[PDB]
Amino acid sequence: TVFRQENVDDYYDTGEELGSGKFAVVKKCREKSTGLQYAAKFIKKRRTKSSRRGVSREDIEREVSILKEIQHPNVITLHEVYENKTDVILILELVAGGELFDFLAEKESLTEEEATEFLKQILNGVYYLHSLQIAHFDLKPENIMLLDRNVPKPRIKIIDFGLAHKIDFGNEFKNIFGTPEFVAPEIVNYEPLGLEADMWSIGVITYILLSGASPFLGDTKQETLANVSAVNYEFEDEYFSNTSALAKDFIRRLLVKDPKKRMTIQDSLQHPWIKPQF
């Protein structure tokens, strides 16, 4: 698929830097014709077929097609796509309240109500994605953004579809590996992956929301991954003593090694706590 090859600077003005990783940088921007503001994600292209630097065209096209399919209040919205020799530039919905990661760092520990208020929005967004057989594969606090961080109950959107895949055969067996603290045992063990991997990541995020602590984190990436594969976590009394037993039940049913026995997204919405790298 070919994207718009006009110079993005003829149509947008860029400003503050919003985010960035290994091969992408995100800048706030404003569309000249409308005055509307967006987030421009500049993704570095591969320079040669066999290179390891940059993102492959196949990977870029897959993220773009996924983004084009989705429209839901709890997921980011793609506006348009440009490209040049060096980058593909995705013009995305601007989510200006920052990462849930930074919100959690800056603020005092969360109440169980504040935690579920964020969690319910994540579950609604993942329910939408899983309904379309889209596995995100990289759910974590850095990939959840707030619309406005100063309201008591901030609204959120899931972002960064760079590892997302359509799962039309129940599972995918590709080069797919996210951030060690959040990946499921099947990712760690290089086994076929499905929607279940997202549900594990949800359990990890829930544990962090309630406690401020990461359940599998070790002193090195290998220790984290070893802990994930062995399901080596526990609910520390110091962190969980006033957390309800039903909250712990929820996490327990997600942090399950066998993907077949793990709660699905529909199970998670019916659960009594909720129901109304080298």
How far apart (Å, rounded) are the C-alpha atoms in residues 112 and 119? Answer: 10
Q: Residue 203 corresponds to which tokens in the numbers above?
A: 């359990």
Give how far Cα 57 sits from Cα of 2, 5, 82, 83, 115, Å: 10, 15, 13, 11, 38
Q: Which residue, among 105, 209, 119, has the nearest Cα to 158 in the 3D structure?
A: 119
Rounded to 5°, the CA angle 28-149-70 comes to 60
Cα 61 off chain centre by = 18
CA angle 173, 77, 36 (to 5 degrees): 150
**What DSSP line would sit under 101-167, residue for residue?**
HHHHHHSPPPPHHHHHHHHHHHHHHHHHHHHTTEE-S--SGGGEEES-TTSSS--EEE---TT-EE-
Question: Domain residues for 117?
Answer: 105-277
224 and 128 part of one domain: yes
Q: Do 125 and 255 have their domain in common?
A: yes
Q: How many residues appear in the chain?
A: 278
Q: Which amino acid is at 223?
A: E
Q: How many Å apart are CA 146 and CA 157, to the nearest integer? A: 7
Asked whether residue 170 falls in the same domain as residue 240, the answer is yes
Q: Do 259 and 122 share a domain, yes or no?
A: yes
* 45 φ/ψ angles, rounded to the nearest 5 degrees: -80, 155
Q: What are phi and psi of 24, to 5 degrees?
A: -145, 150
Contact 156, 104 (CB under 8 A): no
Last residue of a domain, one of 104, 126, 161: 104
Q: How was this structure determined?
A: X-ray
3-state secondary structure of 91: strand
Q: Which CA distances in Å does 246 have to 23, 109, 177, 253?
A: 41, 19, 31, 11
Structure tokens at 88: 């593909």
Please, how many CA atoms are within 13 Å of residue 159, restricted to the half-sphere of its CB?
Answer: 28
Q: Please check whether residue 46 lies inside any domain of the structure.
A: yes
Does residue 110 sit in the same domain as residue 98?
no
Q: Is 18 helix (H, G, I), strand (E, B) or coil?
A: strand
Within a 10 A sphere around the Cβ of 237, how many other Cβ atoms?
8
**Angle between the N-to-C axes of helices 196-211 and 245-252, in degrees from 0 to 180, rounded to the nearest 10:** 150
Report the relative pairing of strands 24-31 and 37-44 from DSSP bridges: antiparallel
Residue labelled with tokens 């401020």: 212
* Residue bearing tokens 């579809």: 161
Residue from 270, 174, 249 nearest 206 by CA: 249
Active site positions, annotated: 138
Q: Which helix (H) or strand (E) holds 38?
A: strand 37-44
Same domain, 88 and 60: yes
Residue 243 forms part of a structural domain: yes
* Same-domain pairing of 215 and 161: yes
138 in the same domain as 53: no
CA terminus-to-terminus distance, the chain? 32
Nearest alpha carbon to residue 126 among 154, 101, 99, 161: 161
Only one residue has tokens 């919405």, namely 269
What's at 2, amino acid-wise? V
Q: With 0-12 CB in 10 A as exposed, 13-18 as middle and 19+ as buried, what is 9?
A: exposed
Q: Encode 214-230: b = buried (16+ Cβ within 10 Å), e = exposed.
A: bbbbbeeeeebbebbbe
In Å, what resolution does this model reach? 1.7
The amino acid at residue 51 is: S
Q: Where on the phi/psi map is residue 157: left (φ > 0), alpha (ψ -120 to 50), or beta? A: beta
Total of domains in the chain: 2
